[model samples]
Target: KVFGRCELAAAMKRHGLDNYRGYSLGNWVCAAKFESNFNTQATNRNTDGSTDYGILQINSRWWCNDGRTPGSRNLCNIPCSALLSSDITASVNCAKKIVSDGNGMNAWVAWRNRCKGTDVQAWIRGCRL
Candidate 1:
């Protein structure tokens, strides 16, 4: 199935990566791998016991409100199941927001580069999608 242009735009906007004009698909994949192994239901705990979850590994306790409120737990202020419910474009866009806001994906790029034994920028280069 082909993704609509508008859908792609909206999805990419969620992460500040403009796919319409130009977006880096590889960067998105790299970030996903580093963040949560691309698992939409992944979860983890901080040393202090706070929670992180989903593909972006959002801090569920903070984003979703561990015990402070009811039904407020959302990564990027969106539902954790958003990645599963939303279309591929929307899911990816949401993931982008979580990583960009935290400056997290930069590390993903580095790790991806190291894993592939190449400089980081090279991966970014010619990665337009």
Candidate 2:
């Protein structure tokens, strides 16, 4: 799914991501941009034999399964394919579960490198919310 920035921000808010686990809307939006450019179907295969799924680019190593890959923690206990859908509720829930595990937004390398301490206002600059 392709969502404009405002649309994305509104979705995140509706999903209660604003200030969830102490992360702001800007943090999630910036990380989503770097990870998937707000595309729900985005997927990336890593050289280590793991694939990242959905807008959060959540990895198979500890989050979801590719069916062919073994040892997936499946922490969210949902199919990897579920995250590829246009509806983001499952993906967002899984992401929140991940952050709740321990590291917060640091679970996403993109967030750490790009959004950790940056001025992220542009991610929500013109959002009606």
Candidate 3:
């Protein structure tokens, strides 16, 4: 599933993550925009053989177990496949875990490179909340 920009923001906000851990809704939207462009089926395989899954592109190495990444942590204790689908519930839940970790939003390179310290409000200006 590919979400419209506003749609993605709405989902995140509804999940009560707008101000989660001091990261605004745009912060989450910004990361999602660059990470997967709101595509729920998005996936990427790392050079180290770890895979990133779903809308947030969660990593298999530390977040979910795909039974592929070496030394997997499976911190979210969820299957990587769960992150893929039209529903953002799984993605949002696992992402909450990711952001709450010590690394915070710094976990996504896309967030740091594209969303960080920018006028991210442009991402949700017309979403109407």
Best by TM-score: 3
lDDT of each: 0.48, 0.89, 0.90
For model 2, where is the 10-residue window of minimal lDDT? 64-73
- lDDT (tens digit, per residue) of candidate 2 on 11-80: 9899999989888889999999999999999999987788999999989988887785667788888889
Can you list the residue pairs that collide in candidate 2?
Answer: none
Give model 3's clash tally. 0
How many angstroms is residue 81 displaced in model 2 relative to the true structure, after the best TM-score fit?
0.3
Model 3 residue 75 lDDT score: 96
Top lDDT model:
3
Error of 2 at 57 (Å): 0.4
User: Ten consecutive residues with minimal summed lDDT in candidate 3?
Assistant: 119-128
Which runs of model 3 end up more than 4 angstroms from their true locations?
A: none
Candidate 2 ranges beyond 4 A from true positions:
none
| Pick by TM-score: 2 or 3, better one | 3
| Candidates arranged by TM-score, highest first | 3, 2, 1
